[PDB]
Design a protein around this ligand. Structure first.
Ligand SMILES: CC[C@H](C)CN(C[C@@H](O)[C@H](Cc1ccccc1)NC(=O)O[C@H]1CO[C@H]2OCC[C@H]21)S(=O)(=O)c1ccc2c(c1)OCO2
Lengths: 99, 99
């Protein structure tokens, strides 16, 4: 689809068998989701945003469907203010910016 | 143009007679720029993201050019690690997400 930006580009995602709402965030390198239970091993990592750094759990090679488009990649879980879909997954679904 | 997301979507902007680099950021409600000494009045604001909040100065009706596309609107100035063009200006240049 073509998504205008008068509102937040929020979409439904499916991860670990659960539906969620997430923000398509071209300013995020990585995908960061709010605290949740996820199947798989993980590794503690640090990620930095506009306000500093937070501790997250890194899940690699996770299946995640974004607005009907399938992706498989890294998902960071931790105290992010909102679920964000970053460029690591936006590229997988073929997302570009256009003006 | 069309911008792929393999790398950060950095573009040149012109603001306050200065050229800078900034991210086209669909996850940013507002536009937040590195510290710069803009003239005129301003109002304090706090904006939150990963890591917490930062204090910024809100300037209204600022003229910005983004890839030769002119816009005018609110710009927040503060100690942000990166310049981000938010949806308040992205809508003005006709920017969409497409997949
Ligand atoms: C609440 C939704 C987002 C987290 C909001 N952020 C825009 C993001 O695009 C941000 C923009 C950004 C980009 C680089 C450094 C700091 C902030 N990217 C980000 O935090 O990404 C992190 C996750 O991937 C990693 O790659 C980049 C940092 C990591 S933000 O910078 O904090 C932000 C921008 C304008 C705003 C605002 C918050 O409140 C209202 O106006």
């Amino acid at each position: 689809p073509q998504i205008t930006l008068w509102k937040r580009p929020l979409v439904t995602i499916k991860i670990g068998g659960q539906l969620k709402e997430a923000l398509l965030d071209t300013g995020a390198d990585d995908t960061v989701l709010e605290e949740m239970n996820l199947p798989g091993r993980w590794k503690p990592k640090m990620i930095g945003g506009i306000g500093g750094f937070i501790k997250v759990r890194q899940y690699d090679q996770i299946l995640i469907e974004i607005c009907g488009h399938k992706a498989i990649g890294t998902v960071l879980v931790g105290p992010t203010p909102v679920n964000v879909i970053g460029r690591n997954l936006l590229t997988q679904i073929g997302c570009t910016l256009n003006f």
